[PDB]
Amino acid sequence: GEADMDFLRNLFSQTLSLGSQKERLLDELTLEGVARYMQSERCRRVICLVGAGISTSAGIPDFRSPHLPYPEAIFEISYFKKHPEPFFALAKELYPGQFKPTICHYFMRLLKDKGLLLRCYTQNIDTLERIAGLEQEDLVEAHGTFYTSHCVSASCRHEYPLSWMKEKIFSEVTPKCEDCQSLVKPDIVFFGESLPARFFSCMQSDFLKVDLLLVMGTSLQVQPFASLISKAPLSTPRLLINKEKAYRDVAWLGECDQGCLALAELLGWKKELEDLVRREHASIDAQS
Ligand SMILES: NC(=O)c1ccccc1Nc1cccc(OCCc2ccccc2)c1
Ligand SMILES: [Zn+2]
């Protein structure tokens, strides 16, 4: 009761000092304020921007981590169209023994299920967002993905699923297009290739009406998202969940999974989320 009054005193004092130009929508710069903000009528659109940190607990590191000219050519598109073998050998070595999304991936599934997710911008090619159930339209796979692959020939472009590529990779035979006999390349954005065009219209408009940015497993100031993030309105709250003046920023520094759990609990979804995760994990265990 005196705490409720103190809560108002702090809110009034922090907004008074902010001053004249900036607008603060969070009633408190905490995970709690963010939960209340996302449970309010103002929060209709949420965009998640995620990186590697949300996959560490699922055991899949970024693959760029540590006769071929320089080490990097294995990541270059033109070197790939001429010498595909090195890449596919590495792809075999690094192929994940499992695809089990994390609590954080499923938290995003809840956002989508509750009609709250405008889009999930990801730097991961690991495919977990799709396994957790996010669809093509909910995503902008910025470094591309190994989920699908295509024939390199412009007048063919035959698509192939992971099933088909996995088999090739472990058999150590170079994937060829059944129709045009041309190479079949994973839809990863190789060095030299570019982010596909339709994603630009997302970037150019999604950030205009976003009500909340959830940045997880990657940092706020690092390019390239930093530039995507800077297109959001200045009043747009941003919650950062990553391992290691302010009026519209809140930070949860710790493991991405524990963070999504604390937020889900504050929203009363903890149980529903832990149920989704147990279920899918068993449902994935029974496929293989
Ligand atoms: N962003 C990247 O990691 C990347 C960028 C350009 C070129 C290659 C890249 N990744 C890469 C390069 C070599 C092998 C590899 O591992 C592939 C295994 C895999 C990928 C995605 C899903 C499941 C398995 C990934
Ligand atoms: Zn083809």
What resolution in Å is listed for this PDB structure?
Answer: 2.3
Atom 8 (ligand 1) nearest CA: 75
Count CB neighbours of 174 within 10 A: 13
DSSP conformation class of 9: H
The CB-based long-range contact list for 275-280 (8 Å cut-off, 24+ gap) reads 276/106, 276/109, 276/110, 277/103, 277/106, 280/100, 280/101, 280/106, 280/132
Output helix, strand, coil percentages for the chain, rounded to the nearest 5. Answer: 40, 20, 40
Nearest to 263, CA basis, from 91, 106, 69: 106
* Separation between Cα atoms, residue 207 and residue 222, nearest integer Å: 17
Cβ–ligand 1 distance for 170 under 6 Å, the answer no
Question: Is there a common fold for 1-58+102-142+196-288 and 59-101+143-195?
Answer: no
- Is 221 annotated in some ligand binding site? no
Q: Say how many Å lie between the CA of residue 150 and the centre of ligand 2.
A: 8
Segments in the chain forming alpha helices (H): 2-18, 31-39, 77-82, 85-94, 103-113, 128-131, 162-171, 198-206, 225-229, 256-266, 270-285
Rounded distance from Cα 151 to ligand 2 centre (Å): 5
CA atoms within 13 A on the CB side of 108: 30
94 within ligand 1 shell (Cβ under 6 A): yes
How far is Cα 41 from Cα 37, in angstroms, rounded to an integer?
Answer: 8
Report the alpha-carbon distance of residue 275 to residue 264 in Å, rounded.
12
Is 232 annotated among the ligand-binding residues?
A: no
Q: What is the rounded distance in angstroms from the CA atom of residue 199 to the CA atom of residue 195?
A: 7
> DSSP letters of 193-226?
B---THHHHHHHHHTTS-SEEEEESS-TTSTTHH
Please state, in angstroms and rounded to a whole number, the distance separating the CA atoms of residues 248 and 236: 7
Ligand nearest to the CA of 180: 2
In words, the CATH class of domain 1-58+102-142+196-288 is alpha beta
Rounded CA gap, 192 and 80, in Å? 10
What CATH superfamily is the domain 59-101+143-195? SIR2/SIRT2 'Small Domain' (3.30.1600.10)
Domains in the chain: boundaries: 1-58+102-142+196-288, 59-101+143-195
Ligand nearest to the CA of 179: 2
Q: Does the Cβ of 91 fall within 6 Å of ligand 1?
A: yes
246: Cβ contacts below 8 Å, ≥ 6 apart: 29
Q: Which amino acid is at 264?
A: A
The 8-class DSSP code of residue 249 comes to E
Ligand nearest to the CA of 125: 1
User: Rounded to whole angstroms, what are the CA distances from 11 to 20, 181, 248?
Assistant: 15, 66, 13
CB-ligand 1 contact for 79 (6 Å cutoff): no
E strands within 13-81?
46-50
Nearest-CA residue for ligand 1 atom 10 is 63
Q: Which of 64, 70, 92 to mutate to test the pocket of ligand 1 (most atoms within 8 A of CB)?
A: 64
Asked if residues 24 and 247 have their Cβ atoms less than 8 Å apart, the reply is: yes
* Contact 125 CB / ligand 1 (< 6 Å): yes
Give the residue carrying structure tokens 């412009």. Answer: 154
Catalytic residues: 143
Rounded distance between C-alpha atoms, residue 104 and residue 106, angstroms? 5
The amino acid present at 131, given as its one-letter code, is I
Buried b (16+ CB within 10 A) or exposed e, 123-139: bbbbbbbbbbbbeeebb
Q: Which experimental method was this entry solved with?
A: X-ray
Ligand 1 and 95: CB distance under 6 A: yes
Cα of 184 vs centre of ligand 2, distance in Å, is: 8
Distances (CA, A) of 73 to 33, 64, 82, 192: 47, 12, 11, 10
Cα 67 to middle of ligand 1, angstroms: 20
Say if CB 88 and CB 169 are below 8 A apart: yes
Tokens of 126: 């690991």
Distance, CA of 218 to CA of 241 (rounded, Å): 8
Residue reference for tokens 């009026």: 247
